[PDB]
Amino acid sequence: LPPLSLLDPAEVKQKSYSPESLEAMSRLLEIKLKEFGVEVSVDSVHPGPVITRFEIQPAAGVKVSRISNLAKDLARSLAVISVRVVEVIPGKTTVGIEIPNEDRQMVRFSEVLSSPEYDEHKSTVPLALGHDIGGRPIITDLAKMPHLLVAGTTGSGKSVGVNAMLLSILFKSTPSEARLIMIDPKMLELSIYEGIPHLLCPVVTDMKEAANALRWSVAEMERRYRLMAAMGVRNLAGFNRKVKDAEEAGTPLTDPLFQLSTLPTIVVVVDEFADMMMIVGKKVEELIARIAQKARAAGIHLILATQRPSVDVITGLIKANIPTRIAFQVSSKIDSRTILDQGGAEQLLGHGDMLYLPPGTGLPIRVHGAFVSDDEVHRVVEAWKLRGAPDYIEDILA
Amino acid sequence: LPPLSLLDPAEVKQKSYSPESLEAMSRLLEIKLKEFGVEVSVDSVHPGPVITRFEIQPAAGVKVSRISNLAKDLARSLAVISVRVVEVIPGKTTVGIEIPNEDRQMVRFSEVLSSPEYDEHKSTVPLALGHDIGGRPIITDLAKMPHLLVAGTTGSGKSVGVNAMLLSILFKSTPSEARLIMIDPKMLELSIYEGIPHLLCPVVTDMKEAANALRWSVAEMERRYRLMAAMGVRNLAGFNRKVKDAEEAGTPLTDPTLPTIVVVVDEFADMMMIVGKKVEELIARIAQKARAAGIHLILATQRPSVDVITGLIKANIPTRIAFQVSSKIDSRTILDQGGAEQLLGHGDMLYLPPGTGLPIRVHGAFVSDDEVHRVVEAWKLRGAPDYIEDIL
Amino acid sequence: LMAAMGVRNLAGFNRKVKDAEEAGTPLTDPQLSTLPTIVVVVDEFADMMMIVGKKVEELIARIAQKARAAGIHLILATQRPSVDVITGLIKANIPTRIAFQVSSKIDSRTILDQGGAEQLLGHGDMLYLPPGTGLPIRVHGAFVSDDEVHRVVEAWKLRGAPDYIEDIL
DNA sequence: ATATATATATATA
DNA sequence: TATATATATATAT
Ligand SMILES: Nc1ncnc2c1ncn2[C@@H]1O[C@H](COP(=O)(O)OP(=O)(O)O)[C@@H](O)[C@H]1O
Ligand SMILES: Nc1ncnc2c1ncn2[C@@H]1O[C@H](COP(=O)(O)OP(=O)(O)O)[C@@H](O)[C@H]1O
């Protein structure tokens, strides 16, 4: 296994944010909202890496839409790019306002991996997203999502996020524990990964080959459900603990359908499925529907990224069974209601700010995506090419 | 290599855009905004060749939308033709107001090429386009686009702009470093480029030779990726450095410099639907795969349509040029937000960068047929190129 | 023939005609005479494009995309400003449009791509939309009676026999 | 009290 | 079916 020292290590941050600067910014926000119609008093300050949440208590008898309908003007009168108004804070009467700082600290990916969450995270598919608005990291199990949608316009830090997720997979799991399928219609980003032992296929370029790979994944899901029926288990981890119990007693439990092995966790990533549904058509959308409908228990998981949030790409069928959404900076509030099904995705800053939406109804966790460099990615790729051979299958492309 | 003096020389340096005249304009703007409900205060003044930016400082309480929803009346009462309100200036607390200036000045192309951004440039295929709001030039780079759709109607800026791009190819590079392929089912516009040493074929008249040229380009893409998989090379300039090190050593190479290829089409609208939609898969495979090979596309059409500019061509080309399609309604076919709303026909354009954001305000620098024909004859003094019959 | 002669428009080829026997120096046939400017008037292309189909629209689009520097022009007249007649094919290629009194703003957006055509006072009072600037220029129509038409037809029939290319049909 | 902004309702590409 | 336009309604003036 690769160590945690291949990365560029933890840097020294420019933490010069004094309490007198916080008091000055608090009084400045009080004045600049008093100059408009509202009147508000700053309650407390949460300083952070990239943004700085202010908990402001409104006056007696002033609404919150009269704060949300001038977020642009409050951002203009403070010499910042854009402010974000959190309309509800769980457990308090205060309204949140998050102002970007000046010395925007780059989130160090080695600081994200150095957490007590990620270090003893037992699951074979973790995701180190990055630090949230208050400094601590957010590590999310990819098994429990079970799938993922990523969006945001170009240059808003999206391939960096997908590379952070794939390196989050690579620093924990062997090719006997996890396994990947990659699709790339734009060979700049994902072609750096061709050679790692966690692959089943060459990095898929054409869309007919990608349709063949997704039909192979349907067939693999169906035969895994039939094999779990033939062994009488319920989920994938139950089958892996069943064959582990066969390993513990030294007892060979043979093939129920003709010796079994620990089936690794397939993860199917897609760089741009908008091009896929635009080239091939509605049957690819129904194929992703038939994947997302059932493959939670079989251990086949989806990472979907797109650059075109619309009704044509992010449809009802894709939003049917993929409830976990990553949204970077997008253009309109209509696109925010397209992916996150609510406003608020447009207020971000670029450079990998995402609104993590967990599975289930909740306020979106604003997580700053950790920057990963081409040198670190290339070093992980070369370490796995020096510690692993490819495991290809011819049938996945035909 | 022709000098920059074969262009027409720099025109009359128009003075009398004085600080007292712009101060009178700024006080006029303060008075005309004070007559309505708002109160404004001009902070600084950014002049320019075509238009002028006024960084105004709004007072306490006045919103931006109050300024934006009377812009028609403000542009009426300033004796100007239009106005635009830049709602955000990064890092400053000031709203930008864009006012068209008095003399709609033409951008001189020698004023574009004389800047050190073009002269000390490092790549081989730049596209000098024009200036900003303040007159500082914007010299882009075609190697990072990596493909460039041009579309528009009504004879707006298109053929002059494509000539400016191809001259930006001409003035820097040699044919050994950057070749060209030209395709035009119109026999008219780009026929003046016949005989220049940067080409590879005649200016294509029979569209079956255009399909065979694109077929040769696809096979060239295939053999260049076979070359790079035989050499372990990501993008073309790495192999150019490797063959430079093999040329310093005289080292021959195996059979699995390479010329940079830029293919233009001016009327693929009727061509792609009459010759066959099999052309579109060729164009999409080139624009997908050959973005690291060196085969770049300056695609141009006279009819920007949903039929001929589909999503299949929108996929691999995120760097777009649109002058006048009809309006901001059918704009989303090529420029995804909005098009000919304040593009003044012959001139200003919207350059969509390889990233995104507010796209670049680019004034289309003028080129004339004397300059075009003179650069063509100056390169025809350097020689006639190689012509491949398999392309034809 | 203009690609053979290296000519950049029609007016350049009439300048080649001025280089020909107009200035007293005859040419060859690669003696090329004048190529006359053709103004093809169509009184009702709605009937044509609803009866015979869309291949006529393919022909009209291949003309209207290209024929400025050619020597063939079209005055298209109709009575249905609708998508059933005027599609987007014959929209972006004819940027100069005459709009008389129509009965809806929808038809005004169908032809002029804006509003204000149904407001006209009738009887030839049109909205000349010039090329380039997409702003309407309102023009009152000039009345010419049928007797003046018979006079001009008589004045041309008393001067020249019909010079036909009869094989057009 | 009433011009403005806006959410929705019907007609069309 | 997505959208451009049109009409009735809070809203703060
Ligand atoms: N966490 C981060 N810190 C700093 N910069 C970032 C971060 N994430 C992304 N970026 C910047 O954003 C850019 C990534 O854009 P990207 O989303 O890959 O474009 P596209 O959507 O076209 O693939 C990079 O150039 C990088 O500089
Ligand atoms: N910088 C400029 N200044 C003034 N006019 C320009 C400039 N650039 C282009 N033009 C005008 O553009 C016209 C040519 O349009 P063109 O590019 O041929 O459109 P199309 O190719 O659609 O016919 C010329 O009349 C020329 O005057």
Author numbering:
A (entry chain C): 315 to 572, 583 to 722
B (entry chain B): 315 to 570, 586 to 721
C (entry chain A): 541 to 570, 583 to 721
Paper text:
Among them, the bacterial protein FtsK is unusual in that it translocates on double-stranded DNA and is also the fastest known translocase. FtsK is an essential part of the bacterial cell division machinery, recruiting downstream factors through its N-terminal transmembrane domain. Its C-terminal cytoplasmic domain, which follows an often very long linker domain, can be subdivided into three modules: α, β, and γ, with β adopting the RecA-fold that contains the ATPase activity. Upon recognition by the γ module of one direction-determining sequence in the genome, named KOPS (FtsK-orienting polar sequences), α and β oligomerize as a homo-hexameric ring around double-stranded DNA (dsDNA) (forming FtsKαβ-dsDNA). To this end, we solved by electron cryo-microscopy (cryo-EM) structures of FtsKαβ from Pseudomonas aeruginosa bound to dsDNA.
The FtsKαβ-dsDNA-ATPγS sample was much more heterogeneous, the particles less symmetrical, and the DNA generally much better defined after three-dimensional (3D) refinement. Overall, three main particle classes could be distinguished, II.A, III.B, and III.E, each accounting for 4.9, 4.3, and 5.2%, respectively, of total particles selected after 2D classification and pruning for highest quality. States II.A and III.B were reconstructed to 3.99 and 4.34 Å resolution and are in very similar conformations. Both structures are moderately asymmetric, mostly due to a movement of the β-subdomains in subunits A and B, turned away from the α-ring. Other subunits are again very similar to the previous crystallographic structure. The main difference between these two states lies in the length of the resolved dsDNA, which is 5 bp shorter in II.A on the side closest to the β-subdomain at the pore entry. From the maps we determined that in these structures ADP occupies all nucleotide-binding pockets, which suggests that they represent stalled states, with II.A having reached the end of the short 45-bp DNA after translocation.
